[PDB]
Coordinates of C-alpha atoms and ligand atoms in Angstrom, one line a residue:
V7 CA -10.5 -44.9 6.6
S8 CA -10.2 -47.3 9.7
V9 CA -10.4 -51.0 9.2
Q10 CA -11.7 -53.8 11.8
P11 CA -8.3 -54.8 13.0
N12 CA -7.3 -58.5 12.8
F13 CA -10.1 -58.8 10.2
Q14 CA -10.9 -62.4 9.7
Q15 CA -12.7 -62.6 6.0
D16 CA -13.8 -66.4 6.5
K17 CA -16.0 -65.1 9.5
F18 CA -17.5 -62.5 7.3
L19 CA -19.0 -64.9 5.2
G20 CA -22.6 -65.5 4.4
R21 CA -26.2 -64.1 4.9
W22 CA -26.4 -60.6 6.0
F23 CA -29.0 -58.1 5.9
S24 CA -28.8 -54.4 4.9
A25 CA -30.4 -52.8 7.7
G26 CA -29.6 -49.0 7.7
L27 CA -27.5 -46.7 5.4
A28 CA -26.5 -43.0 5.3
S29 CA -25.1 -41.3 2.2
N30 CA -24.3 -38.2 0.7
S31 CA -26.2 -38.8 -2.6
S32 CA -29.9 -37.9 -2.1
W33 CA -31.4 -40.4 -4.8
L34 CA -29.6 -43.6 -3.2
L41 CA -35.5 -48.1 0.3
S42 CA -36.4 -51.4 2.2
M43 CA -34.0 -54.1 3.8
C44 CA -32.6 -56.4 1.4
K45 CA -30.8 -59.8 2.0
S46 CA -27.1 -60.0 1.1
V47 CA -25.0 -63.1 0.6
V48 CA -21.1 -62.6 1.1
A49 CA -19.0 -65.1 -0.4
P50 CA -15.2 -65.8 -1.6
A51 CA -14.2 -64.5 -4.8
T52 CA -11.7 -66.0 -7.2
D53 CA -9.3 -63.0 -6.8
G54 CA -9.2 -63.5 -2.7
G55 CA -11.8 -60.7 -2.3
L56 CA -15.4 -61.1 -2.2
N57 CA -18.6 -61.4 -4.0
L58 CA -21.5 -59.4 -2.5
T59 CA -25.0 -60.7 -3.8
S60 CA -28.4 -58.9 -3.0
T61 CA -31.4 -59.4 -3.7
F62 CA -34.7 -57.2 -3.7
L63 CA -38.4 -57.8 -5.1
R64 CA -39.7 -56.2 -8.0
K65 CA -43.3 -56.7 -9.1
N66 CA -43.6 -60.7 -8.9
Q67 CA -40.0 -61.6 -9.0
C68 CA -36.9 -61.4 -7.0
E69 CA -34.0 -59.6 -8.7
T70 CA -30.0 -60.9 -8.1
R71 CA -27.3 -58.3 -8.2
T72 CA -23.5 -59.3 -7.7
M73 CA -20.6 -56.8 -6.8
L74 CA -17.1 -58.0 -7.2
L75 CA -15.2 -56.3 -3.9
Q76 CA -11.6 -56.8 -4.9
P77 CA -9.1 -57.0 -2.4
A78 CA -7.3 -53.4 -2.1
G79 CA -4.1 -53.9 -0.1
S80 CA -5.2 -54.7 3.6
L81 CA -7.4 -57.0 5.1
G82 CA -11.1 -55.7 5.5
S83 CA -10.1 -53.2 2.7
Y84 CA -11.7 -53.6 -0.8
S85 CA -12.2 -51.9 -4.2
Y86 CA -15.2 -51.7 -6.3
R87 CA -15.3 -50.8 -10.1
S88 CA -18.8 -49.7 -11.3
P89 CA -18.6 -49.7 -15.3
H90 CA -22.2 -48.0 -15.8
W91 CA -20.9 -45.2 -13.6
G92 CA -17.5 -44.9 -14.9
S93 CA -16.0 -44.9 -11.1
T94 CA -14.1 -46.9 -8.9
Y95 CA -15.1 -47.0 -4.8
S96 CA -13.2 -48.1 -1.7
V97 CA -15.1 -50.3 0.7
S98 CA -14.0 -51.1 4.2
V99 CA -15.3 -53.2 6.7
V100 CA -14.9 -50.7 9.7
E101 CA -16.0 -52.6 12.7
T102 CA -17.5 -56.2 12.8
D103 CA -18.3 -58.7 15.6
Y104 CA -19.0 -61.0 12.7
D105 CA -21.8 -63.0 14.9
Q106 CA -24.4 -60.0 14.8
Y107 CA -23.3 -56.8 13.0
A108 CA -20.9 -55.1 10.4
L109 CA -20.2 -51.4 9.9
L110 CA -19.2 -50.5 6.4
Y111 CA -17.6 -47.4 4.7
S112 CA -17.5 -46.7 1.0
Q113 CA -16.1 -43.6 -0.8
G114 CA -15.4 -43.0 -4.5
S115 CA -11.7 -42.9 -5.6
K116 CA -11.9 -42.5 -9.1
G117 CA -14.2 -41.2 -11.8
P118 CA -17.2 -39.1 -11.6
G119 CA -18.4 -40.7 -8.4
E120 CA -15.2 -39.8 -6.6
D121 CA -17.5 -37.4 -4.3
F122 CA -19.6 -40.5 -3.2
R123 CA -19.7 -41.5 0.5
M124 CA -22.0 -44.0 2.3
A125 CA -22.6 -45.7 5.6
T126 CA -24.0 -49.1 5.8
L127 CA -25.2 -51.2 8.6
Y128 CA -25.3 -55.2 8.0
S129 CA -26.9 -57.3 10.5
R130 CA -27.1 -60.6 10.6
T131 CA -30.7 -61.0 11.6
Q132 CA -33.6 -59.0 10.2
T133 CA -34.6 -57.3 13.5
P134 CA -31.7 -55.2 14.7
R135 CA -31.6 -54.4 18.2
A136 CA -32.0 -51.0 19.6
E137 CA -28.3 -51.1 20.8
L138 CA -27.0 -51.9 17.1
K139 CA -29.2 -48.9 15.7
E140 CA -27.7 -46.4 18.5
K141 CA -24.3 -47.7 17.5
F142 CA -25.0 -47.0 13.7
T143 CA -26.3 -43.7 14.2
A144 CA -23.3 -42.9 16.4
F145 CA -21.0 -44.4 13.5
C146 CA -22.6 -42.2 11.0
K147 CA -22.5 -39.2 13.0
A148 CA -18.6 -40.0 13.3
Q149 CA -18.4 -40.0 9.6
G150 CA -20.0 -36.4 9.0
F151 CA -23.5 -37.8 8.1
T152 CA -26.2 -35.8 9.4
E153 CA -29.4 -37.0 11.1
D154 CA -31.4 -36.4 7.9
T155 CA -29.2 -38.7 5.8
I156 CA -29.4 -41.7 8.0
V157 CA -31.9 -44.3 7.1
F158 CA -33.1 -47.3 8.8
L159 CA -34.3 -49.9 6.3
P160 CA -37.6 -51.9 7.0
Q161 CA -37.9 -55.5 6.9
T162 CA -40.2 -56.4 3.8
Ligands
CL201 CL1 -4.9 -56.4 16.0
CL202 CL1 -24.1 -53.2 18.8

């Protein structure tokens, strides 16, 4: 539930790399580039890309403001569910720790921690930070995955 104090959304913008995740959903990889840009509604558009066969697919997630800076809500029509997404900790220039949790619909159970890094090569200290962060969130070692570059 913790949100990065004095959250500065403009400093959070730009290119990030999804470098790690932990989740309570078995079926939910490799590192993907994400681009964070402002949304019309004051929140964020999160645009991620991944390779399939010979092509680079693009997906956008609208993160709507949810009442406090660094807190968002995401609506997934295909899963009939809404999810809360919070930037728990970030220094803006190197890393971000995100936590997402279902709020409404059949995905209400869902929980996930995400590591964002400004570079494709996260330092050991950041991998230790993320492991410790997931552990704080009740994720066990088996559910923690570091995402390899390409
Ligand atoms: Cl503060
Ligand atoms: Cl760190």
